[PDB]
Amino acid sequence: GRGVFQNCTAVGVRQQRFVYDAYQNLVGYYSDDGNYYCLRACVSVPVSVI
Amino acid sequence: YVDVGPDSVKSACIEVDIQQTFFDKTWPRPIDVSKADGIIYPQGRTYSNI
């Protein structure tokens, strides 16, 4: 998926790297095997024309 | 197949005495959802504060 990783908290047991927010998109914290990295949705820019 | 150790050479199995009344005891421990008794974490994914 498109994920932006930023420094975050220690939330989660860490037994499973995969995490869900009750929706198909995944928080994906603990992306690194030992390090904690939380991914974010791809940046999208609104475009309009007059 | 795997054999951990040699079969026992004892001539006869040890004598066993069975008494149901002595073993029987009255103790009550009902399951509590608030205490999360006997609850298994989902193996598929970790979950956040939500």
Residue A29: Cβ within 10 Å count: 21
Mark yes or no for CB contact A14/B41 under 8 Å: no
Q: Does B36 touch chain A (CB under 8 A)?
A: no
Cβ contacts (< 8 Å) between B47 and chain A: which residues? 12, 19-20
Report resolution (Å) to 1 decimal: 4.0
Q: Residue B16 and residue B6: Cα distance in Å, rounded? A: 24
Backbone angles phi, psi at B20, to 5 degrees: -65, -40
Q: In the block, which residue shows the tokens 């598929």?
A: B44
Mark yes or no for CB contact A27/B48 under 8 Å: yes
Please name the residue of chain A whose CA is at the shortest distance from the CA of residue B50.
Answer: A21
Residues 6+ apart with CB under 8 A from A25: A1, A41
- Return the beta strands (E) in chain B as ranges: 46-47
**How many distinct helices (H) and strands (E) make up chain A?**
0, 1
Q: Residue A42 and residue A2: Cα distance in Å, rounded? A: 5
Q: According to the entry, how was the structure determined?
A: cryo-EM
The burial class, CB within 10 Å (0-12 / 13-18 / 19+), for A17 is middle
